[PDB]
RNA sequence: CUGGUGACUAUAGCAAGGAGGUCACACCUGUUCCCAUGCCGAACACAGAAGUUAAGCUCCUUAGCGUCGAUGGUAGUCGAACUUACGUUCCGCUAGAGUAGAACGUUGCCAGG
RNA sequence: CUGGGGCGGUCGCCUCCUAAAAGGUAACGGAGGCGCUCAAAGGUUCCCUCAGAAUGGUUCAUUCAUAGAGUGUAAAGGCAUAAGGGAGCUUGACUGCGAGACCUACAAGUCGAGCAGGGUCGAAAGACGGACUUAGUGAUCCGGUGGUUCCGCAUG
RNA sequence: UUAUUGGAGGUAGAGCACUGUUUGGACGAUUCAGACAAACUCCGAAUGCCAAUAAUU
């Protein structure tokens with residue numbers, strides 16, 4: 001989405017990016033999903049741009065689920081300052097994405113339409129992705 | 138600017154001071170703690186600051202009490 | 216009291232037959248009431264409330280205090296049982312209730328067997344005829360019966376104008 | 378809706394509180410009291426080994442005549458003292474069973490204390 | 497609490513027992529029974 | 545078989561139904577005494593025994609909630625080799641979750657019967 | 658001290674995280690607190706149990722409610738043996754110590770069974786050398802005050 | 814040093830039982846499903862640590 005309404009601590013250690021996706025590795029709300037095959041931080045702006053692309057192509061009608069939320073704030077020091085003198089101020093909000101994590105789910109459109117919309121969304125993201133269907137035997 | 142942080146207190150070196158199965162003399166501290174993280178058992182006392190100490194010479198045994206609690210006893214060596 | 220006698224003899228058999236039972240202990244037997252005289256005043260007012268409550272019950276009440284400021288005496292209540300229970304219920308049903316209006320409601324059950332009947336002015340009860348003001352002094356009856364409907368018959372048998 | 382307390386369960390919680398820092402040894406056994414609406418029972422117990430070294434009661438046919446429960450408690454106290462003196466028990470610790478130290482329990486304790494036992 | 501005090505015995509010339517109190521709470525000279533070494537008993541030690 | 549009193553990580557508890565009071569436990573009837581309520585014999589305490597299984601309590605059948613819980617595999621990881629790849633490989637250890645399943649207590653004394 | 662110095666900030670103590678499941682562990686790393694308070698908010702004996710929700714009433718009652726309340730205060734660790742709540746009595750918020758142990762460069766700091774003298778509460782076993790625990794503090798030199806079978810420059 | 818045995822403790826992982834964050838339903842806050850956490854934990858390794866009595870040193 002955009003960001004948490006509040007957090008206990010606004011200056012947090014950065015999350016670990018090694019390993020595989022802990023959970024949310026299956027399509028559970030819709031028919032089709034975008035599965036990450038590569039690890040990265042994903043910002044709220046990246047999420048919003050991908051969402052606009054997918055829903056605009058689908059011409060409404062379908063349903064869109066965003067499965068990742070940018071819980072983690074990250075800080076940035078002011079331009080041109082020496083090292084030290086405390087931690088910087090919150091600059092944005094990110095989610096950690098590891099291989100296997102479903103990023104978006106769609107339903108209510110045909111398979112071809114879902115594929116096209118998810119490809120358009122994936123070109124906005126800093127990760128490699130694969131189109132996945134709801135998993136059965 | 139400046140940081141408002143930078144403070145901490147001296148570490149208090151809490152925790153176990155004798156091993157399960159080890160022989161101790163009376164008065165030996167077995168465990169430093171806040172509260173009763175471990176309870177006093179047989180022949181073991183609990184000091185004013187919750188320190189657990191052996192009241193006799195003997196062998197230290199850490200044992201469970203109830204479902205989610207622990208205790209430490211000292212038993213006279215035969 | 217006569218109310219206790221009528222419970223033991225009259226209301227017992229009628230209640231046993233109305234709600235079929237196998238033993239007389241399943242029969243409803245109203246546990247007690249609570250003459251809660253609540254005075255939401257800061258101060259003088261509480262002494263008058265205590266005096267009035269001691270008048271309408273015959274026993275000293277307990278000055279209740281808030282739980283949230285704290286330690287300020289807010290409420291006041293008196294507990295009656297047995298002979299005082301039956302005598303006070305008879306007095307309230309035969310004199311006080313007709314002296315106010317026509318009678319108590321029939322939907323104000325706590326959902327379990329407790330019947331909350333709150334008088335609207337201290338002048339209804341046959342005491343303190345004289346007088347400061349009306350007080351929301353609630354009378355809450357507690358009973359052994361597990362169901363709400365197993366208690367209207369009991370109150371009516373004692374004379375409740377339902 | 379007026380549910381009623383169970384007196385035995387409440388007094389048993391009180392007994393657990395009492396016995397957290399009270400236990401019978403061989404040198405000093407624990408004299409334990411159980412009280413009912415009619416009878417009062419006593420036992421002398423060693424907590425370390427979980428054994429009972431004496432027993433007297435009000436329902437026992439030795440002393441079950443017509444008398445107050447306080448007098449019966451006195452008889453139970455004297456009988457428990459007799460059994461303790463027949464097993465070599467000299468000094469003990471009294472476990473009031475979670476009941477108040479008044480009335481029948483207190484009379485049992487006075488009789489036991491006034492008939493040989495030491496507590 | 498608020499101020500240090502010294503409690504004095506009626507026989508011992510020692511003022512061994514110092515303690516504290518709140519002047520607003522206890523403005524009156526506080527007194528209590530304390531053990532007195534030189535008499536080997538409890539006596540009445542009073543605020544100086 | 546019941547009770548008193550201990551021990552054990554609820555495998556023991558809660559929930560729903562039914563069965564019982566000979567003694568026993570209990571509810572119960574009262575307040576004179578001991579004692580007792582910031583008020584009330586509700587409780588505590590004391591006399592008792594009109595009665596009643598109605599509830600507590602015992603007993604029985606259920607895995608409904610709770611608790612316990614493998615094997616197999618997965619994650620992680622000690623060590624080693626490769627390597628700089630949000631890593632690979634070998635080796636030992638091996639979760640958590642979930643699955644089958646266990647489970648509607650086992651037992652020490654003392655007394656009664 | 659300082660990612661040169663200055664300016665800004667900081668300087669002792671307590672709690673947490675960073676801290677890699679013993680302990681320890683840095684940065685001008687992330688968060689907070691202390692320089693007290695209480696004659697009961699200490700000791701002991703006895704008793705007691707919460708927040709909240711629903712439902713009824715011109716605070717009370719019933720039902721659930723393993724604590725989601727409270728614990729003087731920051732946090733953490735503990736607490737229904739209650740360490741939380743109330744009442745009766747009381748002053749152990751004692752004197753002389755102290756096996757042994759923790760911590761530790763030193764100086765310091767911490768815990769302590771138990772012995773003796775005199776008590777408090779409890780029927781009794783027993784508990785009590787302050788406070789649920791861990792901050793609330795400052796060396797030496799000098800000086801003031803009280804006591805003192807000590808010394809006191811030939812002797813008193 | 815190793816083997817074996819016992820113990821203290823909460824990291825990796827995992828999880829959502831508490832605190833906080835978050836997505837879509839349902840019913841009228843609760844509930845179903847699915848996620849996130851250095852200062853969250855119903856759980857919980859590998860290792861390391863403290864010890865006790867055999868082999869080597």
Ligand SMILES: [Mg+2]
Pocket residue numbers: 023
């Ligand atoms: Mg999941």
Ligand SMILES: [Mg+2]
Pocket residue numbers: 145146147148149
């Ligand atoms: Mg520290």
Ligand SMILES: [Mg+2]
Pocket residue numbers: 185
């Ligand atoms: Mg202290």
Ligand SMILES: [Mg+2]
Pocket residue numbers: 661662
């Ligand atoms: Mg500089």
Ligand SMILES: [Mg+2]
Pocket residue numbers: 665
């Ligand atoms: Mg400056």
Ligand SMILES: [Mg+2]
Pocket residue numbers: none
């Ligand atoms: Mg470590």
Ligand SMILES: [Mg+2]
Pocket residue numbers: none
């Ligand atoms: Mg550590």
Ligand SMILES: [Mg+2]
Pocket residue numbers: 144690
């Ligand atoms: Mg500060």
Ligand SMILES: [Mg+2]
Pocket residue numbers: none
């Ligand atoms: Mg300051």
Ligand SMILES: [Mg+2]
Pocket residue numbers: 741742
């Ligand atoms: Mg308390």
Ligand SMILES: [Mg+2]
Pocket residue numbers: none
């Ligand atoms: Mg205290």
Ligand SMILES: [Mg+2]
Pocket residue numbers: 810
């Ligand atoms: Mg001279």
Ligand SMILES: [Mg+2]
Pocket residue numbers: none
């Ligand atoms: Mg001279």
Ligand SMILES: [Mg+2]
Pocket residue numbers: none
């Ligand atoms: Mg992790």
Ligand SMILES: [Mg+2]
Pocket residue numbers: 835848
């Ligand atoms: Mg969510």
Ligand SMILES: [Mg+2]
Pocket residue numbers: 067068069835848849
């Ligand atoms: Mg999320």
